[PDB]
Amino acid sequence: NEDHLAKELEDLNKWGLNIFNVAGYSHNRPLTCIMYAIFQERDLLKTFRISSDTFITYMMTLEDHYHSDVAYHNSLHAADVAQSTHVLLSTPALDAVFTDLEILAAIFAAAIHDVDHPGVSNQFLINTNSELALMYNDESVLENHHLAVGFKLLQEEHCDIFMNLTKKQRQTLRKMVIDMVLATDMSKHMSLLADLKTMVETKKVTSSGVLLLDNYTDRIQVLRNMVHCADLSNPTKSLELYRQWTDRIMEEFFQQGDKERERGMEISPMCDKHTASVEKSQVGFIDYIVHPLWETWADLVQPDAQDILDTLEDNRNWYQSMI
Ligand SMILES: N#Cc1ccc(Oc2ccc3c(c2)COB3O)cc1C#N
Ligand SMILES: [Mg+2]
Ligand SMILES: [Zn+2]
DSSP states (O other): OHHHHHHHGGGTTSTTOOHHHHHHHTTSOHHHHHHHHHHHHTTHHHHTTOOHHHHHHHHHHHHHTSOTTSSSSSHHHHHHHHHHHHHHHTOGGGTTTSOHHHHHHHHHHHHHTTTTOOSSOHHHHHHTTOHHHHHTTTSSHHHHHHHHHHHHGGGSTTOOTTTTSOHHHHHHHHHHHHHHHHTTSGGGHHHHHHHHHHHHHTOOBOTTSOBOOOSHHHHHHHHHHHHHHHHTOGGGSOHHHHHHHHHHHHHHHHHHHHHHHHTTOOOOTTOOTTTOOHHHHHHHHIIIIIHHHHHHHHHHHTTTTHHHHHHHHHHHHHHHHTO
């Protein structure tokens, strides 16, 4: 078991680590497991002077604030998105571009980015006049909530993993984490992608092939898109993995739709189990959102995302063939 887990973790730095297996061999604590592994691997506990006690206490509490009864937005998704962010941060075209603080912020953002998710969409919370929707004026409702919960937990006993950052580092990491978690709001996707496209149209590259990211706005725009890419990375994974993720998301979609029906609401796109095509939905989603995003990302970091994009396109065609 320890041996099995260690074996899965050989793939820690690789796209398509099998996080499902990690969850199995870590007694269903994939977020705590993978975060500890990532922080050990990048030396973040040492660099930011975080004790293992404090770190594991925060991560255990964080993971406990993901809902195990929600089919997709649970701690396995968080873990997967944290591990994918960790891989993307090490893309060659981005070597030496980001600071230790930016790396910390990205992985932390990815870890907390869906904490306390109820398993329904922002539109559902809005259309049902949720307390959260009211709190945040219908604006990035769940994403504002994830941030509020992920940060509040840092104030629990033995949980402040940022205690030994400098004041300015703490302030800057909070802003960057906010930015990256808000970037997982699908409402911001088109503007994120437009900015990424600009990034690409005007990219500055060294002789070695590494991207030149002068100002802070350039860096955070890449980091936002990076976390958004990691959040939408399921279709770019090996088909056996992606299919597992699809099963989960449709289960979650069908539950929301059942809630909408029982409340006499109009059922949301892809949430009516009696009429939904899982395959058609995935293809549409890849065509309209995921592929344009990842193709632009691939352009930014060319050729580093060649296999990812090839996998995306192959999975797209496979699902389309299953319609
Ligand atoms: N079709 C479609 C489709 C449409 C929107 C969408 O938006 C998102 C994207 C990421 C996250 C969330 C919603 C909630 O928390 B995040 O994991 C996902 C799918 C899909 N699949
Ligand atoms: Mg989300
Ligand atoms: Zn997510």
